[PDB]
């Protein structure tokens, strides 16, 4: 009835067109066979068509289509569709990343003359972790440091964040729960006989992997140590925890799948001919990436390798998995997109505007892959075509020591951890903002 309302209050002119004379419902039914790019053009033919093409339930569907699940709201006349403004807002954001003028980013100076070893981004809070022994909580909206988490004696190397709870890991073989609001250590977790290297936080439990070859499952609330997973020869490099199984990757070339409650090792995955360094897990598939340049896809329920994906030429550092699409970053300067169902390498992200050194990090979504590198750049790529789009960041020092360690992206901003082993680049975060005004 938002359209009936519109008709009698605007009272458009008489029209001699098929859809103006069709019963209003059958017109919408015809208008529905169109793609949003068409609806947007159709809305500019006449006032009657503009009114018809603002049917809320026609756009609630185009959003559900494109994975837009919430309407947008704002604060003669027009009755705008919130689903339609929601849809446009997103197409504008996408265009902003893709070809929007790059507004100079907020510079977040900190961790002077040290590395940013781990990075978290939740809502409006950024958490940088460093070998300076400290962690720092920032606002993505203001660029101001709000808390410096001092308490660790060795250097921070792992991190996890839910909501105002921060976990940290260090060379001091302790973990630490923190109040992101009050920068207050609430728990110090003891038990690891080596550096606390990786951690993964499911809900009220974090699993930690250590240089001592063990993992420990901890209770974020109480601070207890629920179990200790023992079976790894070499140090434990990467960990994943879905709440039902722990999957771990060790310098001993092995992937281990645990049932934590029983402290039992359910599977030892054998195949990697070198140290496994990176891991993804979706409750069904384990994906491991090795210093042996291969990536393996295993069935968690049988321990069976399903695919061994080859083609990378060096250490697969970071991986991201999402609905059976996998994206891998490697020291070979290349990023690959894979279909872990079929094993096919969908795309190799290289070309004339490829990375010049190793890929340090990546994020992706249904449209884009964001890659960072020691060449001092952050690149944006078309996930669907594999094509280079543009450099979002280009450190002037990229060729002489400038480096991008790590990136986190939201729908509207990109956070970059930047620095250098040699003074060319003051260490800092860059925060890019791709939001649109509406």
């Amino acid at each position: 009835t938002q359209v009936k309302h519109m008709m009698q209050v605007i009272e458009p002119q008489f029209q001699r067109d098929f859809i103006s004379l069709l019963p209003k419902e059958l017109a919408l039914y015809v208008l529905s066979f169109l793609e949003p790019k068409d609806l947007l053009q159709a809305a500019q033919t006449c006032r009657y068509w503009r009114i018809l093409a603002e049917d809320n339930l026609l756009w609630r569907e185009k959003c559900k289509e494109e994975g837009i699940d919430e309407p947008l709201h704002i604060k003669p006349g027009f009755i705008h569709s919130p689903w339609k403004s929601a849809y446009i807002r997103q197409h504008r954001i996408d265009t902003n990343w893709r070809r929007g003028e790059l507004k100079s980013p907020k510079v977040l100076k900190g961790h002077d003359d040290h590395v940013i070893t781990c990075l978290q981004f939740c809502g409006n809070r950024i958490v940088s972790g460093s070998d300076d022994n400290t962690l720092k909580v920032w606002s993505a909206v203001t660029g101001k440091c709000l808390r410096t988490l001092v308490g660790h004696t060795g250097g921070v190397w792992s991190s996890q964040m839910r909501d105002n709870i921060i976990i940290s890991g260090s060379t001091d073989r302790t973990l630490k729960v923190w109040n992101a609001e009050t920068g207050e250590c609430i728990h110090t977790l003891y038990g690891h006989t080596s550096t606390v290297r990786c951690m993964h936080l499911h809900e009220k439990r974090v699993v930690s992997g250590s240089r001592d070859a063990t993992l420990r499952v901890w209770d974020i609330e109480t601070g207890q140590c629920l179990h200790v997973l023992m079976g790894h020869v070499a140090a434990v490099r990467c960990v994943q925890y879905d709440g039902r199984r722990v999957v771990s990757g060790a310098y001993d070339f092995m992937v281990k799948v645990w049932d934590p409650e029983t402290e039992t090792c359910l599977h030892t995955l054998q195949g990697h001919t070198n140290r496994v360094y990176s891991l993804q897990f979706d409750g069904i598939h384990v994906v491991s990436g090795s210093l042996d340049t291969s990536i393996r896809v295993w069935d968690v329920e049988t321990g069976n390798c399903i695919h061994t994906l080859t083609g990378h030429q060096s250490l697969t550092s970071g991986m991201e998995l999402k609905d059976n699409i996998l994206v891998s970053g490697n020291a070979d300067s290349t990023v690959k997109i894979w279909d872990i169902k079929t094993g096919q390498c969908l795309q190799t992200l290289q070309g004339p505007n490829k990375h010049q050194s190793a890929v340090t990090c990546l994020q992706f979504n249904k449209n884009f892959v964001i890659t960072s590198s020691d060449d001092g750049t952050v690149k944006l790529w078309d996930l669907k075509t594999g094509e280079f789009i543009r450099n979002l960041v280009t450190l002037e020092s990229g060729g002489s020591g400038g480096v991008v360690w790590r990136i986190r992206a939201s729908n509207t901003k990109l956070v970059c951890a930047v620095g250098s082993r040699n003074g060319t680049e003051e260490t800092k975060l860059l925060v890019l903002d791709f939001d649109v005004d509406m």
């Binding site: 590395v115 070893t117 070998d131 250097g155 190397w157 060379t171 080596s194 550096t195 290297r197 240089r211 250490l315 550092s317 020291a331 190793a358 340090t360 360690w405």
Partner: peptide, 8 residues
């Protein structure tokens, strides 16, 4: 190569 904790 890349960053890693110092060996103890």
């Amino acid at each position: 190569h890349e960053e890693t904790p110092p060996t103890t």
